[PDB]
Amino acid sequence: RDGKLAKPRQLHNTLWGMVCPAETPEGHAVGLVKNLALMAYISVGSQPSPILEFLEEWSMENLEEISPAAIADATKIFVNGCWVGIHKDPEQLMNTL
Amino acid sequence: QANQKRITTPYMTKYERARVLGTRALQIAMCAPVMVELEGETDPLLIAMKELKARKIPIIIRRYLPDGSYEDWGVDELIISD
Amino acid sequence: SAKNVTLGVPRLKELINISKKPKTPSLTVFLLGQSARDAERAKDILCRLEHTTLRKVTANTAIYYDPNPQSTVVAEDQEWVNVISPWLLRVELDRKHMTDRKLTMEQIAEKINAGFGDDLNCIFNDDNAEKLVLRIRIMNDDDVFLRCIESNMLTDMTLQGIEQISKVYMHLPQTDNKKKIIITEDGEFKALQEWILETDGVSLMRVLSEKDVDPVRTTSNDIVEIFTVLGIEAVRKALERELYHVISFDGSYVNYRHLALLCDTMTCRGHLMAITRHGVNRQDTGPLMKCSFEETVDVLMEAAAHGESDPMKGVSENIMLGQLAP
Amino acid sequence: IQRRLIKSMESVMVKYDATVRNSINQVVQLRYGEDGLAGESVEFQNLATLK
Amino acid sequence: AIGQRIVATLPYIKQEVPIIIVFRALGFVSDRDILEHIIYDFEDPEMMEMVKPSLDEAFVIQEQNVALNFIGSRGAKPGVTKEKRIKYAKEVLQKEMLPHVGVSDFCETKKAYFLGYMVHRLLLAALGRRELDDRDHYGNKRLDLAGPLLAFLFRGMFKNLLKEVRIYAQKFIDRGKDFNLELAIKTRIIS
Amino acid sequence: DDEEETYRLWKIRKTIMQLCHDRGYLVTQDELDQTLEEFKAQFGDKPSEGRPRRTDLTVLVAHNDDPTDQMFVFFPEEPKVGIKTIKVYCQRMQEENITRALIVVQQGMTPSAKQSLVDMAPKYILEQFLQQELLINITEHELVPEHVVMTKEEVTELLARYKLRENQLPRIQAGDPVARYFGIKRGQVVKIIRPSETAGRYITYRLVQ
Amino acid sequence: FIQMSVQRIVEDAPPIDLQAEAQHASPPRYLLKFEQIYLSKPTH
RNA sequence: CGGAGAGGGAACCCACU
DNA sequence: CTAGTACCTAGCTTAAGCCTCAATAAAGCTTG
């Protein structure tokens, strides 16, 4: 708090529908303490392993299988931020997911 | 300094006016003899105001010059602002 | 176009705390004569002030291995007709910035020859072909030396303009005070609208020491630079002007009494006494007085160590002891 | 900013010499406001003989 | 000079380490293999022109062990012998760096792919092909609710409980008579 | 590149001559305000390997009250002047009956020469100036007010009038451009006449420390 | 949290094996591994 | 018996102008 | 044997100290 950098305190564009734009304390906690929108829900977490077994069986390749020759034209898959594999057809896998 | 060499203003400044009135009305509150015939008013501050207006306050002001010297200005002798 | 002048509380901080590095140091350079009247000579003064490196004018840079300078691996009949190291350097400029800043290949080559001596020879194409080529050799740690000198020459060469002034603006002022004001033969004031130019850097000394630049009116908006160039009394006036600028920018009024008193007490010691613990505690006011402000440990131990005596002639000194402050 | 300004000028006052001196009697102005005049008793005026 | 070298300050490492040294320590002796993990299409010379200033910084390390030694020398706990720095830096690369991509016997290829992706992401921002990520973008934020907060705090208290069950066990097994886990467990600490 | 250097040297000479006039030394109006053409015809347009070269373009002047104290100025050819290149000027200092002089250097003077100028200062009160610094007369600037050097008797009159001691005055450091321009030791107060937007004109006194 | 995260925290903790002071005269250990947390309703 | 009233403190949090 | 209680142990800025680099005069060759 009591910091002259107003950038964190400002209402960000990505607060639409997840954080109340109006509701915030007027003291030294403007924008730092923010409440929650009505239908805004916070994910609780689950194991990504079923997603992993589902992913590994359509047409994608793990890192160990392929060479970086064919990695430039295809698309990189991240699961919880870890680079799991590579897929040649982004479309119809997005639709499948 | 001598009476000939008086370089300070002949006007009684607001601070002198406040402090002289306070310290004279305090004396009146401690039953000091009044210098002006009163008409039944009992408040020492109003008594001191009347004495100041009549120019009868038995007090002089020592104005210290910055160099260290001083001047003795009698309340009766310098001009009251109000 | 340059209203990032950081007015308000930040400028008040930059003035009170006299900072070596303000966020927006800028000039208000005025012009002397016919250059102040017409725009072309104003642009001529502008280009002599705006700092220009050789990065600003070149399009791309490439190096080759030509075994023979006569061979001309690149098809250029100019080198054929013009004509000892095989590893050469080639840079392509653009006509746009070239004719914007009014340089010549001869000027660029003589700048190179003066900066680096006769350690290299520049072979420049004439100002007739569509392409703007100058080739660089090294006369007799072989080509990485050429790589490093290429980087050094692109980074800082000062083809035109003076250092530390990056961008300079040019406009006709609308406010009467910033406009030149004269007196006619019938005692009028006849507000004149002449060309002025503002910068985004500050030198204040290589600027006024330039032809056709008015060295009578050029303020620099930089208190420390004014202190270095013009002296403490000019500092007081310039500081007053900059301190009044922020207050009167809002349209509000503050009596000159207070501005004069502040600029006096900030400059009554011959040096720029910035109002911090670095300027207020340095003056010999008294350990008790200066142990009420951003202090009260270092000051007190220093006073105990040096046996300093507090005359108790201040206000915050008599206040501590429960005495009538003067 | 206000506190820092006050702590740098808190002892500057008009002496009975009518000059302006700090706590150590160093002269800041020979007359207050370089005229010796109170700031609460002045007005805005126009100089007729000017322009 | 040369300009635009790429460094990677690493956890439990006092100084920054050039990325190519990191890859060689991770196990890639060659240079083409390392560049295969950063620039995915070799026909883009703009990427090469900015990656070679970092390549020519580290043409004195050619094998895995010298790079391990180089990292260990910069470690917070510098080993006295070569084979101690080797093990310390190997442990750092195995567990401290990039845990989420895997900590197992052989995860070097996956860690190298992810680190080369990180370098590629840095180069994309340097060339302007992409744009800098926003810190206030609440896509980049996560919310620690009662669940995650109590998990973070219970994990530490549970470790503290274990490291006192261990002390009680040591105090009884130094004499070696016997021990009781009921007395060993200090139910006070967690609650 | 000789027109620019000739113009630069002409402005340096003009500023130095104005400096001498303000300091009190005797200068004729003809040399006080001469155009660039007179400088061209009197020195030679060719600072690079030509007749308008330094060292015999230097100026010597004398004070108005008595033509005994005299003030040279010197423009060394060396960019960074040194002891051996100022001991010659000191030898001229001694061979003449002169007391003080100026040195307008081309680039920054060396610290050894600065320490020398400090060391023989009481015998010979000579000071330095920069080529860059003397291309403008700073007193002509609108921010710089009218500075007037007080004589000792009127300094004593000022102190006796205001009943204040020598160190209570506002002060000015000797290193700032205006005090260096006039040329004045410590313990020498300067009248400073400046216009007041509140009441007309205001006189302030800065002492050198 | 109380369903799965406490379970994973209590299970992923490594077992502790502990020896004597390296000898007695001129030492075996144990594992003590635990799992399968149980949680009951508030009691007083 | 006398009217005794003097009644810790640090930390953090929220809030008011 | 155990309990109860009594004794032991986020950024800014600016000076300010600390790290390296270029003239320079003594110290001694060096040949005129």
UniProtKB/Swiss-Prot annotation, chain D:
Disulfide bonds: none
Entry superkingdom: Eukaryota
Annotated localization: Nucleus; Cytoplasm; Chromosome
Coiled coil: none
Transmembrane segments: none
UniProt PTM comment: The tandem heptapeptide repeats in the C-terminal domain (CTD) can be highly phosphorylated. The phosphorylation activates Pol II. Phosphorylation occurs mainly at residues 'Ser-2' and 'Ser-5' of the heptapeptide repeat and is mediated, at least, by CDK7 and CDK9. POLR2A associated with DNA is specifically phosphorylated at 'Ser-5' of the CTD by CDK7, promoting transcription initiation by triggering dissociation from DNA. Phosphorylated at 'Ser-2', Ser-5' and 'Ser-7' of the CTD by CDK9 (P-TEFb complex), promoting transcription elongation. Among tandem heptapeptide repeats of the C-terminal domain (CTD) some do not match the Y-S-P-T-S-P-S consensus, the seventh serine residue 'Ser-7' being replaced by a lysine. 'Lys-7' in these non-consensus heptapeptide repeats can be alternatively acetylated, methylated and dimethylated. EP300 is one of the enzyme able to acetylate 'Lys-7'. Acetylation at 'Lys-7' of non-consensus heptapeptide repeats is associated with 'Ser-2' phosphorylation and active transcription. Regulates initiation or early elongation steps of transcription specially for inducible genes.
Domain notes: The C-terminal domain (CTD) serves as a platform for assembly of factors that regulate transcription initiation, elongation, termination and mRNA processing. The trigger loop allows entry of NTPs into the active site, switching between an open and closed state with each NTP addition cycle.
Subunit structure: Component of the RNA polymerase II (Pol II) core complex consisting of 12 subunits: a ten-subunit catalytic core composed of POLR2A/RPB1, POLR2B/RPB2, POLR2C/RPB3, POLR2I/RPB9, POLR2J/RPB11, POLR2E/RPABC1, POLR2F/RPABC2, POLR2H/RPABC3, POLR2K/RPABC4 and POLR2L/RPABC5 and a mobile stalk composed of two subunits POLR2D/RPB4 and POLR2G/RPB7, protruding from the core and functioning primarily in transcription initiation. Part of Pol II(G) complex, in which Pol II core associates with an additional subunit POLR2M; unlike conventional Pol II, Pol II(G) functions as a transcriptional repressor.
Function of the molecule: Catalytic core component of RNA polymerase II (Pol II), a DNA-dependent RNA polymerase which synthesizes mRNA precursors and many functional non-coding RNAs using the four ribonucleoside triphosphates as substrates. Pol II-mediated transcription cycle proceeds through transcription initiation, transcription elongation and transcription termination stages.
Record-stated family: Belongs to the RNA polymerase beta' chain family.
Protein name: DNA-directed RNA polymerase II subunit RPB1
Portion of the full-length sequence here: 860 to 910 of 1970
